[PDB]
Short mmCIF file of all heavy atoms in Angstrom, two decimals:
data_model
loop_
_atom_site.label_atom_id
_atom_site.label_comp_id
_atom_site.label_asym_id
_atom_site.label_seq_id
_atom_site.Cartn_x
_atom_site.Cartn_y
_atom_site.Cartn_z
N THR O 1021 60.05 117.80 88.24
CA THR O 1021 60.90 118.98 88.13
C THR O 1021 61.53 119.11 86.75
O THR O 1021 62.66 119.59 86.62
CB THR O 1021 61.98 118.97 89.21
OG1 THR O 1021 62.93 117.94 88.93
CG2 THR O 1021 61.37 118.74 90.58
N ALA O 1022 60.83 118.68 85.71
CA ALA O 1022 61.35 118.77 84.36
C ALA O 1022 61.30 120.20 83.85
O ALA O 1022 60.47 121.01 84.27
CB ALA O 1022 60.57 117.85 83.43
N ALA O 1023 62.22 120.52 82.94
CA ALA O 1023 62.33 121.87 82.41
C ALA O 1023 62.97 121.81 81.03
O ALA O 1023 64.14 121.44 80.90
CB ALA O 1023 63.15 122.76 83.34
N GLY O 1024 62.20 122.18 80.00
CA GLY O 1024 62.74 122.31 78.66
C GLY O 1024 62.94 121.00 77.92
O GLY O 1024 61.96 120.33 77.55
N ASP O 1025 64.21 120.64 77.70
CA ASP O 1025 64.53 119.43 76.94
C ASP O 1025 64.12 118.17 77.69
O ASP O 1025 63.67 117.20 77.07
CB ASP O 1025 66.01 119.39 76.59
CG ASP O 1025 66.38 120.38 75.50
OD1 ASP O 1025 65.56 121.26 75.19
OD2 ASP O 1025 67.50 120.27 74.96
N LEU O 1026 64.25 118.18 79.02
CA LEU O 1026 63.77 117.05 79.81
C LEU O 1026 62.25 116.96 79.78
O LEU O 1026 61.70 115.85 79.79
CB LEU O 1026 64.28 117.15 81.24
CG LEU O 1026 64.04 115.90 82.10
CD1 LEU O 1026 65.08 114.83 81.86
CD2 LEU O 1026 63.98 116.26 83.56
N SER O 1027 61.55 118.10 79.75
CA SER O 1027 60.09 118.09 79.61
C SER O 1027 59.67 117.49 78.27
O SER O 1027 58.76 116.65 78.21
CB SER O 1027 59.53 119.50 79.75
OG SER O 1027 59.47 119.91 81.10
N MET O 1028 60.35 117.89 77.19
CA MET O 1028 60.04 117.35 75.87
C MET O 1028 60.42 115.88 75.76
O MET O 1028 59.79 115.14 75.01
CB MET O 1028 60.75 118.17 74.79
CG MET O 1028 60.27 119.60 74.69
SD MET O 1028 58.54 119.75 74.21
CE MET O 1028 58.28 121.51 74.43
N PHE O 1029 61.45 115.46 76.49
CA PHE O 1029 61.82 114.05 76.51
C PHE O 1029 60.81 113.22 77.28
O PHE O 1029 60.40 112.15 76.81
CB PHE O 1029 63.22 113.89 77.10
CG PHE O 1029 63.62 112.47 77.35
CD1 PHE O 1029 63.97 111.64 76.30
CD2 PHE O 1029 63.64 111.96 78.64
CE1 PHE O 1029 64.35 110.33 76.54
CE2 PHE O 1029 64.00 110.66 78.88
CZ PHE O 1029 64.36 109.85 77.83
N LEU O 1030 60.39 113.69 78.45
CA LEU O 1030 59.44 112.97 79.29
C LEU O 1030 58.02 113.00 78.76
O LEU O 1030 57.18 112.24 79.26
CB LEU O 1030 59.46 113.53 80.71
CG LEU O 1030 60.68 113.24 81.57
CD1 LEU O 1030 60.68 114.20 82.74
CD2 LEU O 1030 60.69 111.80 82.06
N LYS O 1031 57.72 113.89 77.81
CA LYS O 1031 56.43 113.84 77.14
C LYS O 1031 56.25 112.54 76.36
O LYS O 1031 55.17 111.94 76.38
CB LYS O 1031 56.28 115.05 76.22
CG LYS O 1031 54.99 115.10 75.42
CD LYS O 1031 55.05 116.18 74.35
CE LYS O 1031 54.25 115.80 73.12
NZ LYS O 1031 54.43 116.78 72.01
N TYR O 1032 57.31 112.08 75.69
CA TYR O 1032 57.26 110.85 74.91
C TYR O 1032 57.81 109.64 75.65
O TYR O 1032 57.39 108.51 75.36
CB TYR O 1032 58.04 111.02 73.60
CG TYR O 1032 57.47 112.08 72.69
CD1 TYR O 1032 57.92 113.39 72.74
CD2 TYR O 1032 56.47 111.77 71.77
CE1 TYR O 1032 57.39 114.36 71.91
CE2 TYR O 1032 55.95 112.73 70.93
CZ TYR O 1032 56.41 114.02 71.00
OH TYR O 1032 55.89 114.98 70.17
N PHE O 1033 58.73 109.83 76.58
CA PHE O 1033 59.38 108.75 77.31
C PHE O 1033 59.22 109.02 78.80
O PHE O 1033 60.12 109.58 79.44
CB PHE O 1033 60.86 108.64 76.94
CG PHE O 1033 61.11 108.50 75.47
CD1 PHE O 1033 61.41 109.60 74.69
CD2 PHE O 1033 61.06 107.25 74.87
CE1 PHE O 1033 61.65 109.47 73.33
CE2 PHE O 1033 61.30 107.11 73.51
CZ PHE O 1033 61.60 108.23 72.74
N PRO O 1034 58.08 108.64 79.39
CA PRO O 1034 57.89 108.86 80.83
C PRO O 1034 58.74 107.93 81.68
O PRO O 1034 58.22 106.99 82.30
CB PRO O 1034 56.39 108.61 81.03
CG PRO O 1034 56.03 107.67 79.93
CD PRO O 1034 56.90 108.01 78.76
N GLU O 1035 60.04 108.19 81.73
CA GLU O 1035 60.98 107.29 82.38
C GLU O 1035 60.90 107.46 83.89
O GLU O 1035 61.05 108.57 84.41
CB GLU O 1035 62.40 107.54 81.87
CG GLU O 1035 62.54 107.34 80.38
CD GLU O 1035 61.89 106.05 79.90
OE1 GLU O 1035 62.41 104.97 80.22
OE2 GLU O 1035 60.86 106.13 79.19
N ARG O 1036 60.64 106.36 84.58
CA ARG O 1036 60.53 106.35 86.03
C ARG O 1036 61.86 106.00 86.70
O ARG O 1036 62.16 106.53 87.77
CB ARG O 1036 59.43 105.35 86.43
CG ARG O 1036 59.36 104.92 87.87
CD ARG O 1036 58.47 103.70 88.00
NE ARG O 1036 58.25 103.33 89.39
CZ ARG O 1036 57.30 102.50 89.80
NH1 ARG O 1036 56.46 101.94 88.94
NH2 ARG O 1036 57.18 102.23 91.09
N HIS O 1037 62.67 105.17 86.06
CA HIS O 1037 63.93 104.70 86.60
C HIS O 1037 65.09 105.38 85.88
O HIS O 1037 65.11 105.43 84.65
CB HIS O 1037 64.06 103.19 86.46
CG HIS O 1037 63.00 102.43 87.20
ND1 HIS O 1037 61.83 102.02 86.60
CD2 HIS O 1037 62.92 102.03 88.49
CE1 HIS O 1037 61.09 101.38 87.49
NE2 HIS O 1037 61.73 101.37 88.64
N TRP O 1038 66.04 105.90 86.65
CA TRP O 1038 67.19 106.60 86.11
C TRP O 1038 68.47 106.05 86.71
O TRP O 1038 68.49 105.66 87.87
CB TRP O 1038 67.10 108.11 86.36
CG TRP O 1038 65.94 108.76 85.68
CD1 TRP O 1038 64.64 108.76 86.09
CD2 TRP O 1038 65.98 109.50 84.46
NE1 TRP O 1038 63.87 109.46 85.21
CE2 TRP O 1038 64.66 109.92 84.20
CE3 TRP O 1038 66.99 109.85 83.57
CZ2 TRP O 1038 64.34 110.68 83.07
CZ3 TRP O 1038 66.67 110.60 82.46
CH2 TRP O 1038 65.36 111.01 82.22
N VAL O 1039 69.54 105.98 85.93
CA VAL O 1039 70.81 105.42 86.39
C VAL O 1039 71.79 106.57 86.64
O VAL O 1039 71.96 107.44 85.78
CB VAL O 1039 71.38 104.41 85.38
CG1 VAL O 1039 72.77 103.95 85.79
CG2 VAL O 1039 70.47 103.22 85.27
N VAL O 1040 72.40 106.57 87.82
CA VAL O 1040 73.45 107.53 88.14
C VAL O 1040 74.68 107.22 87.30
O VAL O 1040 75.19 106.09 87.33
CB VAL O 1040 73.78 107.50 89.64
CG1 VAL O 1040 74.87 108.51 89.97
CG2 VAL O 1040 72.54 107.74 90.47
N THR O 1041 75.16 108.20 86.54
CA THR O 1041 76.36 108.02 85.74
C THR O 1041 77.55 108.83 86.22
O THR O 1041 78.68 108.45 85.93
CB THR O 1041 76.09 108.36 84.27
OG1 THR O 1041 75.63 109.71 84.16
CG2 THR O 1041 75.03 107.45 83.70
N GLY O 1042 77.32 109.92 86.93
CA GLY O 1042 78.43 110.75 87.37
C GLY O 1042 77.93 111.93 88.17
O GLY O 1042 76.73 112.07 88.42
N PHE O 1043 78.87 112.77 88.59
CA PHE O 1043 78.58 113.93 89.43
C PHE O 1043 79.42 115.08 88.86
O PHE O 1043 80.54 115.32 89.32
CB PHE O 1043 78.91 113.65 90.89
CG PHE O 1043 78.40 112.33 91.39
CD1 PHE O 1043 79.26 111.25 91.51
CD2 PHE O 1043 77.07 112.16 91.71
CE1 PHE O 1043 78.80 110.02 91.95
CE2 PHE O 1043 76.60 110.94 92.16
CZ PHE O 1043 77.46 109.87 92.28
N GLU O 1044 78.86 115.80 87.88
CA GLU O 1044 79.67 116.66 87.02
C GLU O 1044 80.04 118.00 87.64
O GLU O 1044 80.98 118.64 87.16
CB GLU O 1044 78.96 116.92 85.69
CG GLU O 1044 77.83 117.94 85.76
CD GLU O 1044 77.33 118.34 84.39
OE1 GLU O 1044 77.90 117.86 83.39
OE2 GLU O 1044 76.37 119.13 84.31
N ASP O 1045 79.35 118.43 88.70
CA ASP O 1045 79.89 119.45 89.59
C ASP O 1045 79.31 119.24 90.98
O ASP O 1045 78.66 118.23 91.27
CB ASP O 1045 79.63 120.86 89.06
CG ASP O 1045 78.17 121.15 88.85
OD1 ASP O 1045 77.59 120.55 87.93
OD2 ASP O 1045 77.59 121.97 89.60
N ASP O 1046 79.56 120.22 91.86
CA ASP O 1046 79.28 120.09 93.28
C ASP O 1046 77.80 120.10 93.63
O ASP O 1046 77.45 119.76 94.76
CB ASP O 1046 79.99 121.22 94.04
CG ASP O 1046 79.65 122.59 93.50
OD1 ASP O 1046 79.68 122.77 92.27
OD2 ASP O 1046 79.35 123.49 94.31
#
Side-chain angles (χ1 to χ4, degrees):
Chain O
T1021 70
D1025 286 13
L1026 190 82
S1027 282
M1028 295 296 172
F1029 171 75
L1030 288 164
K1031 178 191 148 186
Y1032 298 92
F1033 305 96
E1035 301 313 291
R1036 166 194 187 165
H1037 299 94
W1038 296 79
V1039 174
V1040 181
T1041 58
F1043 313 101
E1044 77 170 357
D1045 58 291
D1046 54 314

